[PDB]
Design a protein around this ligand. Structure first.
Ligand SMILES: [Mg+2]
Ligand SMILES: [Mg+2]
Ligand SMILES: [Mg+2]
Ligand SMILES: [Mg+2]
Ligand SMILES: [Mg+2]
Ligand SMILES: [Mg+2]
Ligand SMILES: [Mg+2]
Ligand SMILES: [Mg+2]
Ligand SMILES: [Mg+2]
Ligand SMILES: [Mg+2]
Ligand SMILES: [Mg+2]
Ligand SMILES: [Mg+2]
Ligand SMILES: [Mg+2]
Ligand SMILES: [Mg+2]
Ligand SMILES: [Mg+2]
Ligand SMILES: [Mg+2]
Ligand SMILES: [Mg+2]
Ligand SMILES: [Mg+2]
Ligand SMILES: [Mg+2]
Ligand SMILES: [Mg+2]
Ligand SMILES: [Mg+2]
Ligand SMILES: [Mg+2]
Ligand SMILES: [Mg+2]
Ligand SMILES: [Mg+2]
Ligand SMILES: [Mg+2]
Ligand SMILES: [Mg+2]
Ligand SMILES: [Mg+2]
Ligand SMILES: [Mg+2]
Ligand SMILES: [Mg+2]
Ligand SMILES: [Mg+2]
Ligand SMILES: [Mg+2]
Ligand SMILES: [Mg+2]
Ligand SMILES: [Mg+2]
Ligand SMILES: [Mg+2]
Ligand SMILES: [Mg+2]
Ligand SMILES: [Mg+2]
Ligand SMILES: [Mg+2]
Ligand SMILES: [Mg+2]
Ligand SMILES: [Mg+2]
Ligand SMILES: [Zn+2]
Lengths: 96, 156, 66
RNA sequence: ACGGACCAAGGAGUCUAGCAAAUGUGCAAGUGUAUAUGAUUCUUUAAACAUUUUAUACGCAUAAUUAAUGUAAUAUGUCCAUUGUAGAUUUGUGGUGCCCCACUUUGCAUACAAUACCGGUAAGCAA
RNA sequence: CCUAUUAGCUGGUUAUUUUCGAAAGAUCUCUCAGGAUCGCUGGAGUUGAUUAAUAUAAUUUUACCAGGUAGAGAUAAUGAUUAGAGGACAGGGCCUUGACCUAUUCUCAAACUCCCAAUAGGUAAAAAGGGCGAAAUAACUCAAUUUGUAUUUCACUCAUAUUAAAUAAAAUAACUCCAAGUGGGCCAUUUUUGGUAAGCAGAACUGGCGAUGAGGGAUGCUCCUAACGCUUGGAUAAGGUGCCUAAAUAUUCGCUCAUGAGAUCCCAUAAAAGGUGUUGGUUCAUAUGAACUAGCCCUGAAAAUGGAUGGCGCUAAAGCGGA
RNA sequence: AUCCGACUGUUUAAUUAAAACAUAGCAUUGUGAAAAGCCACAACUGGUAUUAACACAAUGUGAUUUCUGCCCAGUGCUUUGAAUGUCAACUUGAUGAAAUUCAAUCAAGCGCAGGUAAACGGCGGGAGUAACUAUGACUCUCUUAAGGUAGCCAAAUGCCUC
RNA sequence: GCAGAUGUCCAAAGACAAGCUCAAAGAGAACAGAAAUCUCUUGUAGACUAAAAGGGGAAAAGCUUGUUUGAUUUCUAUUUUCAGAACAAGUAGAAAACGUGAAAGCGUGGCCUAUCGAUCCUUUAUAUUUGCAAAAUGACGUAAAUUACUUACUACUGUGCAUAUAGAGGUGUCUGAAAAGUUACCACAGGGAUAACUGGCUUGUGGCUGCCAAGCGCUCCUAGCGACGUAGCUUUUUGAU
RNA sequence: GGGUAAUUGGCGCAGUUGGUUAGCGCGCGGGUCUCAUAAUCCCGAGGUCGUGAGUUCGAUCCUCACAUUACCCA
RNA sequence: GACUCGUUCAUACUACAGUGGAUACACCAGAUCCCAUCAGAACUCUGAAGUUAAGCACUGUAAGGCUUGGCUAGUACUGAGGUGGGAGACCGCUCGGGAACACCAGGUGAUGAGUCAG
């Protein structure tokens, strides 16, 4: 799968028209230490009881979905669009 | 594993007949349909849009919705102790004006004039159809020369 | 250890115990998702008809009492 | 295939909490006198009787919807009580025997739909 | 002592008559000896019909629709497959052979098809409707303030007492509520998969057994007749009429003799191959030869306690095929 | 005459008295002390210990005779350390209004570099070739950390096997 | 049971329009021959269309060109499996903004039938929509007024956290627990719903008995045998259930 | 997922020191003399894990491999 | 006598032959301009010297195919009943339904709306 880095398409934020967008790949981002769930888990793990929550081990998949990140160039607002799961994926390459 | 897909078991049902392949005729697109008409569902496999499901091939229903190139049909279907109404949405190439109703219409149009005349001359006529029944006696004339005698055949 | 795994013996005997039921054959159905731009117009038509009918009814109630 | 040598006595779907459906009873936009207090109540009575000398204890119901700040059911032209199809009962004529028919009058309950309005969300416009 | 700990698993669970009456399928499940959920059952209550009507129907008729199974085909396509015939790349030196082509020829297919049944399915057969003519509303549609299309009114008119084809102890109907038990099945005729087969394993449509007794099959959960309040008479079904055992040693035609006869659904075993036993029939040869055919009988035909047309027995049948 | 155990000794009270256990002999390991080795205790304190390497503690094998081969790649145990990668709390700085956020620093352990088999254990295939056949001293070739040595055998250890 | 396939692949192999016609065969042309390039004649698809198999396709759904990003944002009526519950995969439409084409039209991924995932938690996006429990934080902003606790106006107001709505990170035992062995020292509740004997149905395998006649028997089918085939019996083998 | 190191010629290694941006031993081909071997001296070729900079480089996020130690709520 | 737009989608297709030219449909004469190629072959644009040679229309052929009827044949199969026959494998009877190849014969079209010419 090869995808170009720019794309003219419909904008759904602040200008309901076709304009020019930029295309990249979305990344997960790191879990932050002060979120409510992580504080709950960290307080539960203290004391004298061993592990308190499940830990997954039966991995089966070998790919991930490839959600794209668009961004209007007139207004600077951003939107997500998802694709089908694949193995190799390039953002801007040589044509066939 | 079991294989219950959408088009399973349609090898002979969904294929064109002999020396009759090709897409539909131009007059197919001039048919007139209204709300409440009777209609037949016959799948045409040369058009892959608006394809009806396997079961509803060869069934008859009534129209409840008309669109640009589609028709909604009300069809009965039996489910294990009851009959459920289904709403089938197909494209216009898989739709045919039903012919199951024509005897009723011809009968009404024809009997109207008979009633009009009968009341005109103050008469008592019957218009209900008649079951076929027994025959009256007749005298059948045949010369003795035309009767032929037959008997069982010997085995060879 | 092994047992039966499918049959439909007896099934339509139970089915015909309480007959094969039919749909109820109502007079009107709901035009909720059906053809727009044709039923909105029908709403306008029926509003006009109702306005005329009620204007006549009010008028008659106005004369009859003098 | 397992239990049973014989006889008499004993021997197993109950009680409490909390919810619902069904049915009987009382009152009804309300209903239930809580804990207490009162009395010429006091063998029975640990029962029964009473309620503080334009009248704010509390529960359930009388209004919904939204995470939420909150907002909240035709609308003043008429105390009137949205619209249609079928339909119980009533009103006026005729037909065959108070009953059933053909018109006429009214239109419960309910079934199928339409419309208006209230809370949330989209869309359009926005001090 | 906590403690009468817990058990999806064994065992038990106490008066009468009367009325209705099942499931052993299906979806999900750390699910396969369990459970929830739908289906099948009981009770309660309204709305209807009581007008030989309408609603209605495991049924027909009339009109119309969809199909690729039994059969068929091989010269029509695909894939298999035997043999000659007739024609214009190799073969030693204008002929082997196999080629290539053109008409034929013997034989085939769950996963082949030019064609194509019988059974089995689906829609329709008139009044809350149909037909016809005028108007009124619309922000829809159209080149159209009439182009059309829905709706709203008004006028006219469509069989009915025989009921828009037949038949109907068709309203014993329709709907809502609250709940029980069940979720190991098996068997028979017909179709049918694996297996050499099996009282084996797995499916389909009906009817049964389970949950059910009475007459018959000697005997027997499933075969035949037939389903059940207490009686008195009458006349039968399925099967029987020599005795056991109620009723014919009945009548009227043929066949059979067995030094291991035979005696009827399920059902309780028998074959290939032979006979100069006897009874009928069909052909070829100067009233004699030959070939063939099919009825009863006989040979093929060997197991363990003493035994089984149910027993006795039965041959001018009490055996087999008819009336 | 063969097999096992060297011998006297011990054992499953009530189905096994033995080839099983112990034993003398042999070998290996830890420890110079009240801040040590090995072990007990909740703490405070104890056992060996009225002891001191000819000692105390932890294991294998099992009289005498004759012997005790090769392998440190795997898993254990063990030795060296600021040249050295990773690896906590604390501490120290930077920024910020502050909570946070970020960066640095010689702990032990692993890694890096060595020892050790009377530690756990382990210890190969295919072809050709000698004047009748047969065999293969000899040769070629894959290949391991090392390729079963001295001995012994159809053995209480060999399927085929009577 | 039978013969197989799936956990992928594609900025084009997605969209639209135009022009064109494929496999193969025959006969001809310098090197050139069985196979190189070129001309003609026949050609109903014998080619091609990502991947199993089935269906479809000839001024096209195939080949080549030109322009593109409808593989886009929001909502409904519904089909398949079915309890007529969720996912998932489809069909018919409506409100926006676009592409292609002269135009009618066509386009909400791949000519159709497979190619996939709950609660809780985390992560990035959107908003003139909200909260952090007695209050304030843009800002004393603008206009007045004074002898200050003066007055009237304002969509847009600290860090951090929470919350609504939309994608994503995964459960293949795929309606979704965080999980290694041994018992020849053994325990309990049960099961003939289920194995290790006899008995019962079957008789493949084991054992025994037949039919036909190529041939063996110097010569001679049948004294004694009997190839290639073919019909049975038994329950002193072993299987199957 | 975190930290560190390294990837350059036929092999093995230096350059990471921006206004010079590429080097050496084994190699490879020709003379030198080597009782038939030998220290041998001149030369010719041989390239930076991949895409963009307030720039003249080896200076940036990321991405593919390799090694070591350590981490784990869908 | 001809033409344009359609319907049926082979009785309309295929091979080989014979006949025809008022108008009309074609073949045809050219490349400046719109346009198009390696190539004015095709496509596009401008014409009016020549011809029925071909396209096209109408006919023929013990023509192939297609299409309708007869026959194959109450044959092959099959719904219901049977205390029917037979060791079986299989096969009749009662009440019902009913094919396909092959072979023989006849045919080779018909039609809607509008227009031109003598
Ligand atoms: Mg189908
Ligand atoms: Mg028991
Ligand atoms: Mg007992
Ligand atoms: Mg109540
Ligand atoms: Mg409360
Ligand atoms: Mg408001
Ligand atoms: Mg303003
Ligand atoms: Mg107990
Ligand atoms: Mg009953
Ligand atoms: Mg055949
Ligand atoms: Mg059970
Ligand atoms: Mg019975
Ligand atoms: Mg018997
Ligand atoms: Mg009697
Ligand atoms: Mg008898
Ligand atoms: Mg008697
Ligand atoms: Mg003789
Ligand atoms: Mg008798
Ligand atoms: Mg001893
Ligand atoms: Mg010794
Ligand atoms: Mg002793
Ligand atoms: Mg003992
Ligand atoms: Mg002893
Ligand atoms: Mg010992
Ligand atoms: Mg010792
Ligand atoms: Mg080591
Ligand atoms: Mg260290
Ligand atoms: Mg040796
Ligand atoms: Mg040996
Ligand atoms: Mg095709
Ligand atoms: Mg095209
Ligand atoms: Mg395509
Ligand atoms: Mg599971
Ligand atoms: Mg599951
Ligand atoms: Mg264990
Ligand atoms: Mg059993
Ligand atoms: Mg046998
Ligand atoms: Mg000519
Ligand atoms: Mg012909
Ligand atoms: Zn924008």
């Amino acid at each position: 799968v090869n995808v170009p880095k720019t794309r003219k398409t419909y904008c759904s934020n602040k200008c309901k028209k076709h304009t020019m967008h930029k295309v990249s790949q979305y990344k997960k981002g790191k879990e932050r230490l002060s979120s409510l769930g992580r504080r709950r888990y960290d307080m539960k793990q203290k004391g004298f009881g061993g592990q308190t929550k499940p830990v997954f081990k039966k991995k089966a998949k070998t790919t991930k979905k490839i959600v794209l990140k668009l961004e209007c160039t007139k207004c600077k607002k951003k939107r997500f669009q998802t694709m089908k799961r694949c193995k190799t994926f390039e953002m801007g390459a040589d044509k066939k | 594993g079991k294989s219950r897909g959408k088009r399973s078991g349609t090898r002979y049902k969904f294929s064109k007949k002999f020396r009759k392949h090709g897409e539909c005729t131009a007059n197919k697109y001039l048919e007139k349909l209204n709300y409440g008409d009777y209609v037949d569902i016959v799948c045409d496999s040369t058009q892959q849009k608006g394809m009806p499901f396997n079961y509803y091939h060869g069934k008859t229903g009534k129209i409840f919705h008309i669109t640009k190139r589609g028709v909604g049909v009300l069809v009965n279907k039996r489910v294990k102790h009851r009959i459920e109404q289904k709403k089938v949405c197909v494209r216009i190439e898989h739709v045919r004006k039903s012919r199951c109703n024509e005897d009723f219409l011809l009968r009404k149009i024809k009997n109207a004039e008979l009633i009009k005349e009968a009341k005109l001359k103050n008469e008592h006529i019957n218009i209900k159809r008649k079951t076929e029944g027994p025959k009256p006696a007749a005298m059948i004339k045949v010369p003795p020369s035309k009767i032929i005698t037959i008997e069982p055949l010997p085995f060879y | 250890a092994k047992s039966k795994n499918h049959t439909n013996h007896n099934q339509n005997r139970k089915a015909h115990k309480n007959g094969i039921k039919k749909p109820k054959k109502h007079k009107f159905m709901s035009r909720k998702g059906l053809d727009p731009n044709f039923f909105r117009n029908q709403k306008y038509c029926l509003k006009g008809i109702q306005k005329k009918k009620k204007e006549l009814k009010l008028k008659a109630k106005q004369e009859k009492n003098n």
